[PDB]
């Protein structure tokens, strides 16, 4: 399996915008390697990026810069992967958060858990995500919520 | 969910054995009768 | 009509005659199918504006009432506390509900008993549970249909005009079989009064309406009355009867119910018809002068039919249920807040599972008094044969029936009674220059 | 129960969630002749 | 759309009055059925004496 | 301006409804009062006979 | 008793509700010469509570087993203490006299 000409151009169209430098660098940072894949319409975890990065210090800007000549191979790699998380892997996870299988989960409960488990979110990522559909009760419908996350 | 298809049971016993077999347990640590199942220490608390 | 996919999720038997709540067998109806009628009405839901979820949801809750009858308790005589031989029977119930499967299969037989105010436990003896499970499915149905009508009126409320109405009374009953019980009584006790409103309207309210309008009319009447027999106003209906003022005391039986009728109504009140010796060790039958026929009712069983008890816990655990539509069917609010003082219910009033006959007092006042104030339009439909046969008529039956629906006296007044009636301002303005 | 080594704290938590699941209300009894350590625990049970 | 709404009010005013009557009569009938109990109560206590 | 008049029509509706609900509380307290008398009958009946 | 009244009055903030738990707290085995109305209460309970173990731990589980109709030969352990709780000849006996 390879990368078609449409795949090349999309990677570039973003890469030029990403590499924000007066002088070159014809390179991104291993952190931008993440958000690029996101912007490209891919969805890897930080752990997936750490699965494919030779930087055991994640996260930070200032260690190794990567060219597109290193990015495109990594993209071909991501294109192969299946373990990303489906709707099914989420429909599983939701079925303990409903205190009585309805879809309608409590916003305050959703807050406490996202901050503690999985990857963990920041204060902002919590508050930002819950700005709707919050009704006068506080019932975030976990399924349509997930379908939106799938949608983009 | 993949353990039991459309029509595994039928005999509620026979399709429980299919699902519990898929989850690698024997019908002795937890015992079957007619109506009920009997759980020893941890067994139910391991299903959790 | 359901497809092989839905058959899985919905949990129908592939095979037929499995279903235990379907007695006798699979009886047919002359000329209709069962299958294609499904697709028609399901589309009728789409046409109502049901959500794609709720389509399956209402069917989910409705279908379990077939599933429940399968739970086959078996005698294990060491105590007589039977537990039912299976799980599939009650699982096809559970899943459609999304109630805690463990809470179900345990709690049904061993619930937490309110003793005074504290909590004890008990296994129920075989028959106690068997009937108590049968209670559960019929408990869902009474609730679901009451939920259904209220939720269906919702789509059709007069979206902000001047709520002006006609009232059409459609109560399907006055059926004569060997079996008539309390069910037939509560229904036929409205049909009696409707027939009385025919008297009150054909003689009376017709010309009362004329009187108000002030027309060239002459009052005429004949003695066709029922009132000295059948209660009219809510209060008479809400004093009626021994299944009202004594429905809570442990000593009252369906035997004594017939007796206290026999003391208070018999002899002096000529309208009441007494049994032909099923008294003393009785099925307990009685009859009253109902225009269209002397109905044979049976009394035994009215207590439980007016108490309607079930297992607490298992419904209380249904309250903590899922599938939205499954859940809503369970609680209070009912768009109203009031204290519960019992013998019932919620309003009206507090708790004894049921006392529906009292709930049929409240609404009874609200329908009737308003119905007096509304213009009567009537159609007095008569039956040609018992045999359910199209086109056929019998003379002996019709002989009796035309004598019984006050049709004679009914034509004696309604021979001049105007069937056309509009507004005089219009007719005057619309005819003008003819002359 | 099958997470923790034998200590009073789990004797509590095990019964707690069981009550929360199966609805069974419950009562602990400590036993020993006269010279064990009964009420010595029970003070800690209350605090826990 | 405001005018479409308002028109329901002259009507609901008449709606309420009829119910105000009917549940006042329902209250009266209930008060009477309580009055028979209160009045017979004197007899019940007298007979016990 | 009819917005205020809209609410004014609603105010007649507020009182007609507030009155009725209070008459439900009228019958409501009477719910304990009524059945208490029905119970007081039955015991006194057993005291007499 | 003044305290027991006062404290339940002050530390019960939710009358008529369940659920409920409890812990049983009593002494053990002791003996004393002057047997009057009092001392009999203690050793009798240590006994009956041992029997509360015996019945629950060996028997009660089986009372349902025997009824289930499962291949299970009953297991007696020969630990009974029933014949002291009430009088065989006449119920209560001592109390009534």
Swiss-Prot record, chain A:
Q: Which domain of life is it from?
A: Eukaryota
Q: Which GO terms describe its biological process?
A: cardiac muscle contraction; positive regulation of ATP-dependent activity; regulation of striated muscle contraction; regulation of the force of heart contraction; skeletal muscle tissue development; ventricular cardiac muscle tissue morphogenesis
Where Phosphotyrosine occurs, the residues are 87
Signal peptide positions (record): none
Mind telling me which GO cellular component terms the entry cites?
A: A band; cytosol; I band; muscle myosin complex; myosin II complex; sarcomere
Alphabetically ordered keywords of this record:
Cardiomyopathy, Disease variant, Methylation, Motor protein, Muscle protein, Myosin, Phosphoprotein, Repeat
Cystine residue pairs: none
Ranges for domain EF-hand come to 6-43, 85-120, 120-152
Which GO terms label this protein's molecular function in UniProt? actin monomer binding; calcium ion binding; cytoskeletal motor activity; myosin II heavy chain binding; structural constituent of muscle
Q: Which residue positions does Phosphoserine occur at?
A: 136
What exactly does this protein do? Answer: Regulatory light chain of myosin. Does not bind calcium.
Quaternary structure and interacting proteins, as annotated: Myosin is a hexamer of 2 heavy chains and 4 light chains.
Q: Which disease is it linked to?
A: Cardiomyopathy, familial hypertrophic, 8: A hereditary heart disorder characterized by ventricular hypertrophy, which is usually asymmetric and often involves the interventricular septum. The symptoms include dyspnea, syncope, collapse, palpitations, and chest pain. They can be readily provoked by exercise. The disorder has inter- and intrafamilial variability ranging from benign to malignant forms with high risk of cardiac failure and sudden cardiac death. Rarely, patients present a variant of familial hypertrophic cardiomyopathy, characterized by mid-left ventricular chamber thickening.
- What is the official name of this protein in its record? Myosin light chain 3
Q: Which organism is it from?
A: Homo sapiens
The gene for this chain is MYL3
Swiss-Prot record, chain C:
Question: How does the record comment on the protein's domains?
Answer: The rodlike tail sequence is highly repetitive, showing cycles of a 28-residue repeat pattern composed of 4 heptapeptides, characteristic for alpha-helical coiled coils. Limited proteolysis of myosin heavy chain produces 1 light meromyosin (LMM) and 1 heavy meromyosin (HMM). HMM can be further cleaved into 2 globular subfragments (S1) and 1 rod-shaped subfragment (S2).
Q: Which organism is it from?
A: Homo sapiens (Human)
Subunit structure as annotated in this protein's UniProt entry? Muscle myosin is a hexameric protein that consists of 2 heavy chain subunits (MHC), 2 alkali light chain subunits (MLC) and 2 regulatory light chain subunits (MLC-2). Interacts with ECPAS. Interacts (via C-terminus) with LRRC39.
Q: From the entire protein, which fragment is shown?
A: 292 to 726 of 1935
Q: Which domain of life is it from?
A: Eukaryota
Name the disease: Cardiomyopathy, familial hypertrophic, 1: A hereditary heart disorder characterized by ventricular hypertrophy, which is usually asymmetric and often involves the interventricular septum. The symptoms include dyspnea, syncope, collapse, palpitations, and chest pain. They can be readily provoked by exercise. The disorder has inter- and intrafamilial variability ranging from benign to malignant forms with high risk of cardiac failure and sudden cardiac death.
- Name of the encoding gene: MYH7
**Role summary:** Myosins are actin-based motor molecules with ATPase activity essential for muscle contraction. Forms regular bipolar thick filaments that, together with actin thin filaments, constitute the fundamental contractile unit of skeletal and cardiac muscle.
**Chain spans, region Actin-binding:** 364-386
Q: Which residues form the Myosin motor domain?
A: 1-435
Q: What is this protein called?
A: Myosin-7
């Amino acid at each position: 399996i390879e990368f078609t000409p449409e795949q090349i151009e999309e990677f570039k169209e973003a890469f030029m915008l990403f590499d924000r430098t007066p002088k070159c660098e014809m390179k991104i940072t291993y952190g931008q390697c993440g958000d690029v894949l996101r912007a490209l319409g891919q969805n890897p975890t930080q752990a997936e990026v750490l699965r494919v990065l030779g930087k055991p210090r994640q996260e930070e800007l200032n260690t190794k810069m990567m060219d597109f000549e290193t990015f495109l191979p990594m993209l071909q790699h991501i294109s192969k992967n299946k373990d990303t998380g489906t709707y099914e892997d989420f429909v599983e996870g939701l079925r303990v958060f409903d205190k009585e299988g309805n879809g309608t989960v409590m916003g305050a409960e959703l807050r406490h858990v996202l901050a503690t488990l999985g990857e963990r979110l920041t204060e902002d990522e919590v508050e930002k995500l819950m700005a709707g559909q919050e009704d006068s009760n506080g019932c975030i419908n976990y399924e349509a919520f997930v379908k939106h996350i799938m949608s983009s | 969910p993949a353990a039991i298809p459309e029509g595994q049971f039928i005999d509620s016993r026979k399709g429980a054995e299919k699902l519990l077999s898929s989850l690698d347990i024997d019908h002795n640590q937890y015992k079957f009768g007619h109506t009920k199942v009997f759980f020893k220490a941890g067994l139910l608390g391991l299903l959790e | 009509n359901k497809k092989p996919e839905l058959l899985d999720m919905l949990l129908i038997t592939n095979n037929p005659y499995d279903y235990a709540f379907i007695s006798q067998g699979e009886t047919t109806v002359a000329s209709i199918d069962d299958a294609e009628e499904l697709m028609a009405t399901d589309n009728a839901f789409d046409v109502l504006g049901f959500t794609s979820e709720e389509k399956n949801s209402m069917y989910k809750l409705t279908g379990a009432i077939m599933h429940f009858g399968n739970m086959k308790f078996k005698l294990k005589q060491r105590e007589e506390q039977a537990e039912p031989d299976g799980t599939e029977e009650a699982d096809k119930s559970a899943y459609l509900m999304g109630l805690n499967s463990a809470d179900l299969l345990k709690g049904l037989c061993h619930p937490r008993v309110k003793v005074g105010n504290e909590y004890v436990t008990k296994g129920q003896n075989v028959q106690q549970v068997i009937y108590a499970t049968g209670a559960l499915a019929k408990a869902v149905y009474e609730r679901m249909f009451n939920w259904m009508v209220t939720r269906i009126n919702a789509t059709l409320e007069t979206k902000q005009p001047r709520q002006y109405f006609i009232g059409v009374l459609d109560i399907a009953g006055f059926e004569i079989f060997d079996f008539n019980s309390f069910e037939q009584l509560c229904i036929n006790f409205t049909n009696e009064k409707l027939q009385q409103f025919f008297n009150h309207h054909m003689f009376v309210l017709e010309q009362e309406e004329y009187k108000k309008e002030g027309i060239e009319w002459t009052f005429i009447d004949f003695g066709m009355d029922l009132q000295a027999c059948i209660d009219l106003i809510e209060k008479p209906m809400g004093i009626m009867s021994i299944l009202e003022e004594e429905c809570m005391f442990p000593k009252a039986t369906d035997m004594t119910f017939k007796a206290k009728l026999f003391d208070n109504h018999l002899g002096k009140s000529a309208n009441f018809q007494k049994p032909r010796n099923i008294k003393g060790k009785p099925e307990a039958h009685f009859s009253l002068i109902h225009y269209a026929g002397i109905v044979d009712y049976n009394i035994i069983g009215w207590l439980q039919k007016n108490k309607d008890p079930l297992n607490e816990t298992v419904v209380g655990l249904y309250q903590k249920s899922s599938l939205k539509l499954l859940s809503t069917l369970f609680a209070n609010y009912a768009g109203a807040d009031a204290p519960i003082e019992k013998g019932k219910g919620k309003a009206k009033k507090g708790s004894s599972f049921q006392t529906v006959s009292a709930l049929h007092r409240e609404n009874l006042n609200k329908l009737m008094t308003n119905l007096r104030s509304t213009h009567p339009h009537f159609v007095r439909c008569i039956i040609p044969n018992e045999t359910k046969s199209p086109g056929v008529m019998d003379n002996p039956l019709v002989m009796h029936q035309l004598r019984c629906n006050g049709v004679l006296e009914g034509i004696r007044i309604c021979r001049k009674g105007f069937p056309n009636r509009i507004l005089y301002g219009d007719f005057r303005q619309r005819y003008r220059i003819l002359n | 129960r099958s997470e923790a080594p034998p200590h009073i704290f789990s004797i509590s938590d095990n019964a707690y969630q069981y009550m929360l699941t199966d609805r069974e209300n419950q009562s602990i009894l400590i036993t020993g002749e006269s010279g064990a350590g009964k009420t010595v625990n029970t003070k800690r049970v209350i605090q826990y | 759309e405001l005018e479409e709404k308002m028109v329901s009010l002259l009507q609901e005013k008449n709606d309420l009055q009829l119910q105000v009557q009917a549940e006042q009569d329902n209250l009266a009938d209930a008060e009477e059925r309580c009055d028979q109990l209160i009045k017979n109560k004197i007899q019940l206590e007298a007979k016990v004496k």
